[PDB]
């Protein structure tokens, strides 16, 4: 029947589930890193 999207969903949910995730701590680290390393070129600050 409407299994067409039921299969799409899972196939896609499996697709997204199988990925490596960086610990939020590192992500936050990289975000700040970019900010501080580029603050000197943000005239709305520097």
């Amino acid at each position: 029947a409407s299994i067409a999207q039921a299969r799409k969903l899972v196939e896609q949910l499996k697709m997204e589930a199988n990925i490596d995730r960086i610990k939020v701590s590192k992500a936050a680290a990289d975000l700040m890193a970019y900010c501080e390393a580029h603050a000197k070129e943000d005239p709305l600050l520097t």
């Binding site: 029947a1 409407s2 299994i3 039921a6 299969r7 969903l9 899972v10 896609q12 949910l13 499996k14 697709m15 997204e16 589930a17 990925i19 995730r21 960086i22 610990k23 939020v24 701590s25 590192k26 992500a27 936050a28 680290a29 990289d30 975000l31 700040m32 970019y34 900010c35 501080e36 390393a37 580029h38 603050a39 000197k40 070129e41 943000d42 005239p43 709305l44 600050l45």
Partner: protein
């Protein structure tokens, strides 16, 4: 029951994903950013005011030269402004008045627009004739055009009310790729600084990351409680912000596959019309249904400032390539240049 199996596998996979994200939430963004000196206070002023639209402005897009910018208005006009002199460069007559988005090509040779006409119209402003004429019309979408963006002078990506995005070869008019998966009208689009990926926002309250090459939806980001109207990449292409009618903005990190911060206040209940990052990505600006725009500290998640001048809603806003200025389009028919 063939259906019940999928209905459960989908749910378990959902928990698994949920467990993966929780496991990565070892530290909060605020936890690692509490050692960053706050932005303090930002008092940006209107340095210029573009006056020429006779009705409310819907969208606007800065040019690469960080000087010129296009804006589409209910007055059926598509104007190219010289932000420095406030003078107009061009003023194309729109065949429609229900225009939703307009974009500037990086080379500064073209501009595009779309709306309830379900068509992305490309205009040439660098014609060897000196007169702007529709160089191409990209019919194809079965819904309204909510956003379009130039990859270059040959390709453009557009989001539509038909719940899909598409990449177009402007020259041939062909639709080289269709991005499907969303279950609600896509409202916004933002290209990764490397042009290889792009994030989208839809009424299904989720944002999606896409691989321009394989047309696949690599990641989906849940969180919002209603329509996401604005999407915008972080300057390093590893994160991006959102703006929903849930009265909050959210920064999601691609690599950590989840939300890192919510930019809200119990004192702000209006929806977000558009959002954009400062050049270093330290600041996150956002327009609301109200008369003001908020300037947020992307990392400390604190509102560091406000842009107060428009008499009606701020519908669109953006920051120049050099990060030197900010521009905002309002329903008050005006465009203000801040810094």
């Amino acid at each position: 029951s063939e259906l019940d199996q999928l209905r459960q596998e989908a749910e378990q996979l959902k928990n698994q994903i949920r467990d993966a994200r929780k496991a990565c939430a070892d530290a909060t963004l605020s936890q690692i950013t509490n050692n960053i000196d706050p932005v303090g206070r930002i008092q940006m002023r209107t340095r210029r005011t573009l006056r020429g639209h006779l009705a409310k402005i819907y969208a606007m897009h800065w040019g690469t030269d960080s000087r010129l910018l296009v804006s589409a208005s209910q007055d059926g006009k598509l104007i190219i402004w010289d932000s420095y002199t406030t003078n107009k460069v061009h003023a194309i007559p729109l065949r429609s008045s229900w225009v939703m988005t307009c974009a500037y090509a990086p080379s500064g040779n073209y501009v595009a627009c779309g709306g309830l006409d379900n068509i992305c119209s490309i205009y040439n402003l660098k014609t060897r004739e000196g007169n702007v004429r529709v160089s191409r019309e990209l019919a194809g979408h079965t819904g309204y055009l909510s956003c379009c963006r130039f990859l270059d002078d040959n390709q453009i990506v557009t989001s539509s009310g038909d719940t899909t995005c598409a990449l177009w070869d402007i020259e041939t008019g062909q639709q080289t790729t269709t991005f499907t998966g969303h279950t609600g009208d896509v409202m916004s689009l933002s290209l990764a600084p490397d042009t290889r990926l792009f994030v989208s926002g839809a009424c299904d309250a989720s944002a999606k990351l896409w691989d321009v090459r394989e047309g696949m939806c690599r990641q989906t980001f849940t969180g919002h409680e209603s329509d996401i109207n604005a999407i915008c990449f972080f300057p390093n292409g590893n994160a991006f912000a959102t703006g929903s009618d849930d009265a909050t903005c959210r920064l999601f990190d691609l690599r950590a596959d989840q939300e890192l911060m919510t930019y809200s206040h119990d004192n702000i209940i209006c929806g977000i019309t558009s959002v954009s990052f400062s050049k270093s990505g330290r600041l996150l600006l956002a327009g609301y249904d109200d008369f003001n725009c908020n300037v947020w500290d992307a990392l400390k998640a604190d509102r560091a400032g406000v842009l107060a001048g428009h008499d009606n809603r701020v519908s669109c806003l953006g920051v120049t390539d050099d990060g030197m200025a900010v521009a905002t389009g309002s329903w008050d028919s005006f465009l203000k240049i801040w810094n």
